[PDB]
Every structure is written in C-alpha cells, then in structure tokens.
Design an enzyme around this catalytic site. Sequence first.
Site, PDB file in Angstrom:
ATOM      1  CG  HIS B  41       3.107   2.819  -3.355  1.00  0.00           C
ATOM      2  ND1 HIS B  41       2.144   1.960  -3.371  1.00  0.00           N
ATOM      3  CD2 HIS B  41       4.418   2.483  -3.690  1.00  0.00           C
ATOM      4  CE1 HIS B  41       2.727   1.086  -4.010  1.00  0.00           C
ATOM      5  NE2 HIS B  41       3.869   1.300  -4.365  1.00  0.00           N
ATOM      6  N   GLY B 143      -0.024  -5.112  -8.694  1.00  0.00           N
ATOM      7  CA  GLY B 143      -0.253  -5.777  -7.513  1.00  0.00           C
ATOM      8  C   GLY B 143       1.134  -6.368  -6.916  1.00  0.00           C
ATOM      9  CB  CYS B 145       4.162  -2.626  -5.016  1.00  0.00           C
ATOM     10  SG  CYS B 145       3.594  -1.871  -6.442  1.00  0.00           S
TER      11      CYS B 145
HETATM   12  C1  LIG Z   1       1.799  -1.717  -6.703  1.00  0.00           C
HETATM   13  C2  LIG Z   1       1.645  -1.702  -8.341  1.00  0.00           C
HETATM   14  O1  LIG Z   1       1.529  -2.547  -8.872  1.00  0.00           O
HETATM   15  N1  LIG Z   1       2.039  -0.477  -9.094  1.00  0.00           N
HETATM   16  C3  LIG Z   1       2.070   0.892  -8.404  1.00  0.00           C
HETATM   17  C4  LIG Z   1       0.481   1.637  -8.339  1.00  0.00           C
HETATM   18  C5  LIG Z   1       0.716   2.738  -7.555  1.00  0.00           C
HETATM   19  C6  LIG Z   1       1.432   3.269  -7.060  1.00  0.00           C
HETATM   20  N2  LIG Z   1       1.492   4.593  -6.233  1.00  0.00           N
HETATM   21  C7  LIG Z   1       2.549   5.707  -6.220  1.00  0.00           C
HETATM   22  C8  LIG Z   1       2.058   6.680  -5.268  1.00  0.00           C
HETATM   23  C9  LIG Z   1       0.682   6.133  -5.045  1.00  0.00           C
HETATM   24  C10 LIG Z   1       0.165   5.242  -5.677  1.00  0.00           C
HETATM   25  C11 LIG Z   1       2.951   2.641  -7.040  1.00  0.00           C
HETATM   26  C12 LIG Z   1       3.036   1.526  -7.725  1.00  0.00           C
HETATM   27  C13 LIG Z   1       1.858  -0.261 -10.548  1.00  0.00           C
HETATM   28  C14 LIG Z   1       2.816   1.029 -10.950  1.00  0.00           C
HETATM   29  O2  LIG Z   1       3.661   1.156 -10.510  1.00  0.00           O
HETATM   30  N3  LIG Z   1       2.461   1.852 -11.961  1.00  0.00           N
HETATM   31  C15 LIG Z   1       3.476   3.101 -12.335  1.00  0.00           C
HETATM   32  C16 LIG Z   1       3.279   3.273 -13.873  1.00  0.00           C
HETATM   33  C17 LIG Z   1       3.223   3.944 -11.220  1.00  0.00           C
HETATM   34  C18 LIG Z   1       2.018   4.557 -11.040  1.00  0.00           C
HETATM   35  C19 LIG Z   1       1.696   5.356 -10.206  1.00  0.00           C
HETATM   36  C20 LIG Z   1       2.928   6.005  -9.245  1.00  0.00           C
HETATM   37  C21 LIG Z   1       4.109   5.447  -9.564  1.00  0.00           C
HETATM   38  C22 LIG Z   1       4.177   4.518 -10.636  1.00  0.00           C
HETATM   39  C23 LIG Z   1       2.751  -1.291 -10.845  1.00  0.00           C
HETATM   40  C24 LIG Z   1       2.908  -2.022 -12.091  1.00  0.00           C
HETATM   41  C25 LIG Z   1       3.796  -2.954 -12.762  1.00  0.00           C
HETATM   42  C26 LIG Z   1       4.852  -3.157 -11.690  1.00  0.00           C
HETATM   43  N4  LIG Z   1       4.986  -2.583 -10.525  1.00  0.00           N
HETATM   44  C27 LIG Z   1       4.020  -1.919 -10.155  1.00  0.00           C
END
Ligand SMILES: *CC(=O)N(c1ccc(-n2cccc2)cc1)[C@@H](C(=O)N[C@@H](C)c1ccccc1)c1cccnc1
Lengths: 302, 302
Positions: B41, B143, B145
């Site tokens: 991602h 951050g 991930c």
């Molecule tokens: C890496 C990260 O910390 N997070 C995350 C951001 C973006 C994506 N992403 C999926 C497809 C394109 C970009 C994945 C993970 C955030 C997070 O996961 N927020 C959730 C609500 C989410 C947002 C967007 C898509 C999927 C899920 C994060 C926050 C807290 C803990 N882990 C991750």
Amino acid sequence: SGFRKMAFPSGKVEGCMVQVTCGTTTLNGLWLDDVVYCPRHVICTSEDMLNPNYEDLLIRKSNHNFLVQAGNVQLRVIGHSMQNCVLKLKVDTANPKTPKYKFVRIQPGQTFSVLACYNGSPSGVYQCAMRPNFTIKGSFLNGSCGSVGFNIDYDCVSFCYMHHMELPTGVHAGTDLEGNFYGPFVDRQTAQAAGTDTTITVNVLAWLYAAVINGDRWFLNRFTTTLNDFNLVAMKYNYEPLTQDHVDILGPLSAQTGIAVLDMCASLKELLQNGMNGRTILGSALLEDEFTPFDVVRQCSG
Amino acid sequence: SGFRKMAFPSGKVEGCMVQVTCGTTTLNGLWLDDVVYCPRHVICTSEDMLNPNYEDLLIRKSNHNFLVQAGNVQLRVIGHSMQNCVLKLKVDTANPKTPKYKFVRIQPGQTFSVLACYNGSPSGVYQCAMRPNFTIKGSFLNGSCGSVGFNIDYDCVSFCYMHHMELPTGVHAGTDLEGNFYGPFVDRQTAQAAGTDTTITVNVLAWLYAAVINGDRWFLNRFTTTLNDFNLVAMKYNYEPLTQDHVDILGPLSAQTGIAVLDMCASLKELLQNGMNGRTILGSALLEDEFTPFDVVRQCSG
Ligand SMILES: *CC(=O)N(c1ccc(-n2cccc2)cc1)[C@@H](C(=O)N[C@@H](C)c1ccccc1)c1cccnc1
Ligand SMILES: *CC(=O)N(c1ccc(-n2cccc2)cc1)[C@@H](C(=O)N[C@@H](C)c1ccccc1)c1cccnc1
C-alpha cells in the site's frame, strides 16, 4: 489506536549480558566497557546466607576465582572490587557492543523495561514500575539475578535496576548499578517484609487520559473537584497524594484531550467510590497505574 | 514467581528494520538477505485508496521510484515484485545483521512479540495474540505499518505478522510475510468489520495454571466436570470449544500443579457463571487469554 504495556527495544542491552560464575552459583552480569557488574551475592554459599560478611568473603576470593563467559567465550578478570551490593569485575577486553549508557537511580512510580536473563542469555522483555514501597512486581525465576532494568534515551541506554532477590510476598527487590538497594531490603536470607503498596495516582490519570484518547470515555462524569477534596478521598484507598507537579506533568494529555486535570480527578473519585460495575477501561477490569504520563505520550503521540 | 505479558528480546529484529518511501508515503520494511519486505500500500495515493488497482499502479513505478533507507544509509533497488499484499524489493546489499529466520503463518490463539516501528526506527516491543476473528488488539499509530510480529526459536527468528491497517473498531489487521491477510481483510479504504471476538479457552486455562503456580488458588472449587458439560457453558459466553488436543497441550501444567485439566475447567465454569466478585487473579480483575500454555511453561519453568 490501542494501548499495551510496551517495552523499549532490548537490542543494545542483549549485547551487554554475560554469565558470571562461582562454584555451584552462576548468575547474570552486565559488561560495559572493561567492567562487568553483578550482584555481590554470587560469592556466598548456602551456609553463609543467614548472615554473610561480604568483605571477609571477598578476601577469600581472587581475580581468577570468577568465570565470566560471553556466549561461547571467556573473559580474563584483571581486577575485582565491591561497590555497595555489586561486584565490579575488571576485564582485559572492552565490550565492542557497549552502547552509550548512564546509571540513574529511578524514583518510585517511574517505569523501566526489564530484560529477564538466565545463564547470561536474554530470555524476555517486559515493562515494570518502581512501586512506592520500592519493590517491583517482576517475573523472575531462579537464576534471574543480575537481570537489568533500563530506559532508552534516544540512543543512550539508562540502566536503573539490577535484580537481586524475591521476597516471600513473591515480589522483587534490587539495586541501582552503583549497588544501593531500592528500599530497605538487604542481600541476606532474613525476614524482610514489603510495606503497604499504594497506587501511583499520576499514572492512573495518565491511563484514564490514554483511555479517552482511545475513545473509551464512559467513566467521564459531569462533575469536577479540588486537589484537597480529591486527595482526602485518595488517602482512604491507599493512593499517592496528587501534587501541582503531578498536575503540570499531565498538561500535555489535558491539552490533547481537551479535558481539565481536575475533571479527570472527579471521574477517578467516582470510580474509586463506586468501582467499575463490571465495565472495563482499555481492556482492564481495574485501574492501571504502571504507565507514566511520558509512557502514555510516547504510545499515544509517537 | 511473578507473571507478566513478556516479549521476546527484539535484538535480532531491530537490525532488519528499514525505512521505505514513495512521495508523501514513508513506512517500515524488513531487510532479510538481499530482499526488503513492506506492505504494497506504500505505492497508493489518497485518491486511489477507495478502490486501488495495485497491478496497474506498480506498472507506473520502477526500481528507482522506491527510497529504502537503513539508518543514515540508502540501498539500491535492483528489482521489485509483488507477492500478494507485500512488496519484495531486491537490493544490491545483503543485510549483514540477517539472523537465521523462517516465515510461518501462525494460527488463531497463538501469540507473538510485535516490534512497533516508526520511520524504520524500532520504538517498542509488546506481546500480542492472533484473535479468533484474526484481528490483533495492537498498539500502532500512523506510520506503524510494515512493523513485524515474530517468535524466537532458540536462535531462529520466526516472522508471523506484518502490520497493514487499523479497523474502525481500533483493532489491527495484517499479513504473514508471504503477504496473505490473516482473516478476510483487504488493503483498501472500504467498510470492513471484525466478526465476534471469542475468548481463547486453552489460553485462559494456561493462565489459571500460571495463577496456581504463583500461589493464587482461591478460585479452585471442590468440583470437577466433563468436556461436553464444560463446552456447553463455554459456547454461552463466546468461548472457543475445548478439544482433547487442548487438554493434551495442558498436560505439562496439569503435571506440574498436581491439578487435573477437568478440575481447572470446573473452576472456570464457576468463574464464568459467578464472575470474580471483585477478587483478582494474577493482578487482573478479568480472565486473561493472551498467554498460551508454552508462554506459561517458558515464564513459569525457564
Ligand atoms: C500505515 C498507517 O499507519 N495507516 C495506514 C494508512 C494508509 C493505508 N492505505 C491503504 C490503501 C492505501 C493506503 C493503510 C494503512 C494508518 C491506517 O491504517 N488508517 C486506517 C483507518 C486505514 C486508512 C486507509 C486505508 C485503510 C485503513 C494506521 C493507523 C493506525 C494504525 N495502523 C495504521
Ligand atoms: C539469583 C536467584 O534467582 N535467587 C537468589 C538466590 C540466592 C540469593 N542469595 C543471598 C545471599 C546469598 C545467596 C539471592 C537470590 C532466588 C531468590 O532470591 N530466592 C529468595 C527466596 C532468597 C533466597 C536467599 C536469600 C535471599 C532471597 C530467586 C528466585 C526468584 C526470583 N529471583 C531470585
């Protein structure tokens, strides 16, 4: 989101853990520069535990009496001494893995990661707090002694604790790395009792502040209260007095949550007086006090 | 004595954690041999999260599009691919700190240490379990991930988990290191719900067995019971069925405590039906299920 008892990464401490030996007695030591540090009780025999004279005993031993082992290797003890309740064993070789370090005497209520070591091999890591009675509620087995507590200051490892003994309570007593005991405990086999264990009040509020930030906000009451009012109720349930320092230290969490310190106190007062009714906060059915405000900021900020 | 949620020492994993970048997007990667592994991602933009076509997107990128940073240093990406939901980025340089490792897909109920990483810098360690709904109740921030779960097999690090996303529940979803999700979760910004979280029954019994060994034995009843009898009551409170495997796996603790498995079950049945009356076991006001029998043996044996 999420809140867990989190330890510092233990990597820079793994490389400092050595095996130290005398006869039937092997415990852990800590090799920093050209010095190895361990509990001085490694010189004792089962006959001389009831009341040992450590000075006298050390007289009986020499440099070559002590088998310091690094993994598969052996170190040459080119000098020993005794600093309070620790053996400082000088060695030919400086640890090439010595991280930048400090020795700090930590204050009761403060927390640190423990690297639980058997036979100089790191076995596991957990977060622990100095309790106000200056015990720790560890997880140590026979052979654990010389296992260390530390915090990591950016790249600087701070060593705060060395494990020396288990009390009949099943709780743990140890020293700083200058060999002075936390609390009144002595390194002899006599009747010693841990005093009244009191709850760490700033830490509980830290944790309620973590709870709010995680969306768990049910316990929040419409009320507020005063320091004196709150500290009268506190004393009744064996809790530390809350001070203006304590209040100031919670400002960043106050500031992040939008919630005044004194309104969090009012929530705690009602939680103390009514219990939790089977309701949980951050997956606990009781009030947690082994996170500081820093631990909460670090885990809930970055 | 003592029982704590204990992590494996994280030292051999610290040395495998790298920063991986695309534009406004930096996450963590895992550098083993001449391959770096991260969540695919990292190639997405905020426009293409609702329904991204990862194949199509990767077409748009080349070897030099990806900034892999090791502390202060940079690696040359000499090849990339996609294995399910992970980027395998090939590099000129083999990690000189690569420990012996395996990639295992862990089973629900099993536990592992997490090394929580921001910007390729290890921030902290905690023990976690695959829940039966195949979520984890982590502690991750933005951050986090690419942060990994692992067990340590003597000297062999087993990687079982890579962190990919937080659910609106505030719980965590991720993959094995071959890039297949634990559970039905997908790496896109759509409505996804974690199913009913059920208690891990063997783990709770493990923990009661830890409790006994620590001298906490109040909950022990004069009664016993049957599998079927116990599993009828279990189902009623969202608990995993207990099986003869589960029984066999608890033999060492049965064997150490002197207590038959089925008498521990009878104690649990009464604890489930009556709650705990404000009484605690191993410092918890509720039944803990994030320790396996192994975790209990390791911590209560050596
Ligand atoms: C890496 C990260 O910390 N997070 C995350 C951001 C973006 C994506 N992403 C999926 C497809 C394109 C970009 C994945 C993970 C955030 C997070 O996961 N927020 C959730 C609500 C989410 C947002 C967007 C898509 C999927 C899920 C994060 C926050 C807290 C803990 N882990 C991750
Ligand atoms: C190192 C160790 O694991 N323990 C220990 C053994 C012996 C001594 N000792 C003091 C003077 C001479 C030898 C200290 C510590 C045991 C342990 O501490 N048992 C307690 C009951 C104890 C025995 C003897 C003297 C003082 C205390 C141990 C067990 C579990 C956790 N930590 C230590």
